[PDB]
C-alpha cells in the first residue's frame, strides 16, 4: 500500500557515542535440560553425509563472535587437511568455505602525521604460498587437472565485501586483499594497504551507521587467518577457473564453527516384550 | 538431573547390552549485583531439571511404574505388534529401530497401560 | 505368555529446533563490551563437561540446514546492538 511506491521513510536515530573497548571472548552454546548436542569427531568430515564417529556433549566448544569478510579471523583449525565446504558446488553462487590446518598470522597495525586514516597489514610470505598450495591441491581434488588462473581480486560491489572488513579495538579496518590473491597455478612480507572507514554499512540489517573519529595511538591486531570465503566463475566451453573472494553473509561465519554439531531430544521411554 | 546424557552411551549397541548398561551406568553415575543474576540463572537451570524429572516420573506414575527403572506390566501383547521371535528382538535390533518400527502402535500401548489401572 | 515391559533410560533421539543458551565464563568486573554482555545475558561455565563417546552409531549431519546458526546469529545481533552504539543510524521502513 500503495502500491509500488511503498512509503520508504529512511528514519534516523541519534545516540551518544562513547569510545568502547572490543575484544571477543569465546562462547559456549549449551543445550537445556532434556536435550543433547551430537558431535562429529571425523577429522575429514565434509559437512554433509554420514559421520560414523559421533560423540555426545552437553555444550559446545569455545566460539568467538568474530565478524569479518573474505577471511575468517581467530577461528578454529581443521585436524588433518585443508577442508573445502559448500552447499552446492556447480552452483557458482554459494560461498566456498575453505578451512586451513595451520594459522597464517596477520599483523594489522596503526602506527603513530600520523595520518589517522591509514594502517597496514603484514602477511608472512612463503607461509602464505604454502597455504595456497595446499588449497589448490584440495581444489584440484574436487575439480580435476585445471589451471587455477587465477585467485583474482574482488569483483566489486559493496565496500565491506570488496575488502577485508573487520573490527579491531573498536575501529573498523577495511583492508585491500588484492595483492594477497594474485596467482595462476599450472599443473619478503606482503603489506596490505588498510584504511579506517567510518560511514559503514551495517551487517545486522539493511542500513548505514556513522561512528566516532579514531582513537589516540597504536592499534595492534595480532590475529590468525584460519579460513577463506571464495566464490567462482561459471562457464565456459575447458577452461581455467577463477576464485574471487567474497563473503558478507555472516551466517557463513557460523557455518564454520557450528559445523560439527546437531541438537537432539532425548526420549527415554520404551516398551518391549517380557518373559514374566 | 545431568544423567540424561549417560543414557545415550548405549545407543548403537543392541537391546540387551543397553538393558545391562541401564543398571550399570545408573549405579555409577550417581555479593556484587552481577553475581546474584548468575546465582538465579543457575537455580533456574537446576529447578527446571528437577521439575522435568518429576514430570517424567509422574508419567510413569499413571502406569504403576513410578520410580522403577524397569517394570513388567499386565497388558498382554496382541501379537500384531512386531510379530517377531524375540531372540531377533533382543539380539538383532537397536532402540532406534524400535522407535521406528512400533511407532504406529505406541499410542495404543499407552492407552492400554492407562486403562489397565482401572 | 509375553507382554509389555515399560523401561526408562532408553537411548532414543528425535530432532529439535529449540531454545539454547549461551555461554562461557566472563569476568564480571570489566568494561570490555563482550564481558559486559556475557555477564548480563549468559551463564557461567561448568568445569566438568561430559563428552560421552558413542558406540557404532551413524548419524547423517547436514551443515547447511542447521537451526543452531540462526540462534547464535540473533544473539550476536543483540551483542552488536548493545555494545557498539552508533552515532547516527539510517535504517529504512518501507511501510
Amino acid at each position: 500500500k500503495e502500491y509500488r511506491l511503498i512509503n520508504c521513510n529512511t528514519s534516523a536515530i541519534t545516540q551518544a557515542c562513547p569510545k568502547v573497548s572490543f575484544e571477543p571472548i569465546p562462547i559456549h552454546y549449551c543445550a537445556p535440560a532434556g536435550f543433547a548436542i551430537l558431535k562429529c569427531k571425523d577429522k575429514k568430515f565434509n559437512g554433509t553425509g554420514p559421520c560414523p564417529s559421533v560423540s555426545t556433549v552437553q555444550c559446545t566448544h569455545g566460539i568467538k563472535p568474530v565478524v569479518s569478510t573474505q577471511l575468517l579471523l581467530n577461528g578454529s583449525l581443521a585436524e588433518e587437511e585443508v577442508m573445502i565446504r559448500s552447499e552446492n558446488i556447480t552452483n557458482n553462487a554459494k560461498n566456498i568455505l575453505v578451512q586451513f590446518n595451520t594459522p597464517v598470522q596477520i599483523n594489522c597495525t596503526r602506527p603513530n602525521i600520523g595520518d589517522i586514516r591509514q594502517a597496514h597489514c603484514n602477511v608472512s610470505k612463503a607461509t602464505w604460498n604454502e597455504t595456497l598450495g595446499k588449497v589448490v591441491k584440495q581444489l584440484r581434488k574436487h575439480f580435476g587437472n585445471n589451471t587455477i588462473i587465477r585467485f583474482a581480486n574482488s569483483s566489486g560491489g559493496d565496500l565491506e565485501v570488496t575488502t577485508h572488513s573487520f573490527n579491531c579495538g573498536g575501529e573498523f579496518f577495511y583492508c585491500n586483499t588484492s595483492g594477497l590473491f594474485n596467482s595462476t597455478w599450472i599443473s619478503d612480507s606482503i603489506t596490505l594497504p588498510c584504511r579506517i572507514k567510518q560511514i559503514i554499512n551495517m551487517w545486522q540489517r539493511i542500513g548505514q551507521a556513522m561512528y566516532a573519529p579514531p582513537i589516540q595511538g597504536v592499534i595492534r591486531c595480532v590475529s590468525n587467518i584460519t579460513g577463506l570465503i571464495l566464490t567462482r566463475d561459471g562457464g565456459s566451453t575447458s577452461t581455467t577457473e577463477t576464485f574471487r573472494p567474497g563473503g558478507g553473509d555472516m551466517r557463513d561465519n557460523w557455518r564454520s564453527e557450528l559445523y560439527k554439531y546437531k541438537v537432539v531430544k532425548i526420549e527415554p521411554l520404551g516398551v518391549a516384550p517380557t518373559r514374566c | 538431573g545431568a544423567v540424561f546424557l549417560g543414557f545415550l552411551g548405549a545407543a548403537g549397541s543392541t537391546m540387551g547390552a543397553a538393558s545391562m548398561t541401564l543398571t550399570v551406568q545408573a549405579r555409577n553415575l550417581l555479593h556484587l549485583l552481577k553475581l546474584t543474576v548468575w546465582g538465579i540463572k543457575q537455580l533456574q537451570a537446576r529447578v527446571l531439571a528437577v521439575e522435568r524429572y518429576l514430570r517424567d516420573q509422574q508419567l510413569l506414575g499413571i502406569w504403576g511404574c513410578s520410580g522403577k527403572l524397569i517394570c513388567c506390566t499386565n497388558v498382554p501383547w496382541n501379537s500384531s505388534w512386531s510379530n517377531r521371535n524375540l531372540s531377533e528382538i533382543w539380539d538383532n535390533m537397536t532402540w532406534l529401530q524400535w522407535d521406528k518400527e512400533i511407532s504406529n502402535y505406541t499410542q495404543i500401548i499407552y492407552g492400554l497401560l492407562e486403562e489397565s489401572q482401572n | 505368555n509375553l507382554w509389555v515391559t515399560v523401561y526408562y533410560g532408553v537411548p532414543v533421539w528425535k530432532d529439535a529446533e529449540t531454545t539454547l543458551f549461551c555461554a562461557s565464563d566472563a569476568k564480571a568486573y570489566e568494561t570490555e563490551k563482550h564481558n559486559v554482555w556475557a555477564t548480563h545475558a549468559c551463564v557461567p561455565t561448568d568445569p566438568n563437561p561430559q563428552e560421552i563417546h558413542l558406540e557404532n552409531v551413524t548419524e547423517e549431519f547436514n551443515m547447511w540446514k542447521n537451526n543452531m546458526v540462526e540462534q547464535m546469529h540473533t544473539d550476536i545481533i543483540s551483542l552488536w546492538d548493545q555494545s557498539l552504539k552508533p552515532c547516527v543510524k539510517l535504517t529504512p521502513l518501507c511501510v
Partner: antibody
Framework: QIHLVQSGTEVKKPGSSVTVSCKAYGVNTFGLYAVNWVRQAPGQSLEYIGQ??????????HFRGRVLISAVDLTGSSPPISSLEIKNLTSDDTAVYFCTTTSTYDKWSGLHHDGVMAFSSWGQGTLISVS | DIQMTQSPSTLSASIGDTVRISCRAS???????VAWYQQRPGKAPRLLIY???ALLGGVPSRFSGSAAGTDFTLTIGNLQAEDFGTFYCQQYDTYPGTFGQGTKVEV
C-alpha cells in the same frame, strides 16, 4: 526438485558388458541420499537390482558378480553420477532400467528401513535390448 | 524373500467410483512396511503411499490406505481420468524388497 536424468536407449550383444548413466540434478549428495537401481522386463513387474547407500555398493543375490554400481559425488562441473555396469550379458536382460533416489536424512521418516527403501523419486527409463 | 500377492489382477471402474485394491503378504508385516506406486504407461512409476497410510506430499488427498498385518487396502474415492494406470504394492520389510503384480485399472 530432483530431476534425475538417465542415458538413452541402447542395444548390445550377448556375452558382453554395458553401462547406464544416472545424473542426479537437484541432489545434495549421495551421502544423504541413496540410489537404488531397479529394472523392469517388458510386461513384467519391477525387479530390484542394487544400491549404494552410505557409499556401500551392494547388489541382490540374483545379480552378484555380474553387476557393478559406482558413484561420483557433485564435484566441480558435473552433478552426482551413478552408473550401472553389467558384465556377461544374456538375452534375458532386455529390460527398462531405472535409477531411483530416496532421502535417508531423517531416521524417523518411514521411507527407509535399515537400508531397505521405498523409491521416492525416479528416473525416466533406459531400455536395453540384447541381440 | 517374502512374496506379495496383489488382488485383483485386473479390474475396471468409472469416474467417481470408490475402488478397493488389496495386497496380501505371505507373512505378516507388523510395522506396515508397504509402499504403493502408480505407473502410467510410457512413464516412470511415481510413489503414492508409504508406510501403509502415510500420504506423500505431492499427492491429491483422494486416496486412503489401511493396514491389518497381512491385508493392505488401497481405497480411491472420487476416481478421476488421470488415475488410470497399473498399480503396485511393495514390501520393503526385509531385504530385498519385492513388488506386487499390477492392478490395471481401466474403463
Amino acid at each position: 526438485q530432483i530431476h534425475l536424468v538417465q542415458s538413452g536407449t541402447e542395444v548390445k550383444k550377448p556375452g558382453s558388458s554395458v553401462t547406464v548413466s544416472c545424473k542426479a540434478y537437484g541432489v545434495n549428495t549421495f551421502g544423504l541420499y541413496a540410489v537404488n537401481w531397479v529394472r523392469q522386463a517388458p510386461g513384467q513387474s519391477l525387479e530390484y537390482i542394487g544400491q549404494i547407500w552410505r557409499w556401500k555398493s551392494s547388489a541382490s543375490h540374483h545379480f552378484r558378480g555380474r553387476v557393478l554400481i559406482s558413484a561420483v559425488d557433485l564435484t566441480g562441473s558435473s552433478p552426482p553420477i551413478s552408473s550401472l555396469e553389467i558384465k556377461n550379458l544374456t538375452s534375458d536382460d532386455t529390460a527398462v532400467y531405472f535409477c531411483t533416489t530416496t532421502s535417508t536424512y531423517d531416521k524417523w521418516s518411514g521411507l527407509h528401513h535399515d537400508g531397505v527403501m521405498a523409491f521416492s523419486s525416479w528416473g525416466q527409463g533406459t531400455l536395453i535390448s540384447v541381440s | 524373500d517374502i512374496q506379495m500377492t496383489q488382488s485383483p489382477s485386473t479390474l475396471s471402474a468409472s469416474i467417481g467410483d470408490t475402488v478397493r485394491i488389496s495386497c496380501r503378504a505371505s507373512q505378516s508385516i507388523t510395522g506396515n512396511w508397504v509402499a504403493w506406486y502408480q505407473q502410467r504407461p510410457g512413464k516412470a512409476p511415481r510413489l503414492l503411499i508409504y508406510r501403509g497410510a502415510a500420504l506423500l506430499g505431492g499427492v491429491p488427498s483422494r486416496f486412503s490406505g489401511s493396514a491389518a498385518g497381512t491385508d493392505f487396502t488401497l481405497t480411491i474415492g472420487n476416481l478421476q481420468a488421470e488415475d488410470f494406470g497399473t498399480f503396485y504394492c511393495q514390501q520393503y520389510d526385509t531385504y530385498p524388497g519385492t513388488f506386487g503384480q499390477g492392478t490395471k485399472v481401466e474403463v
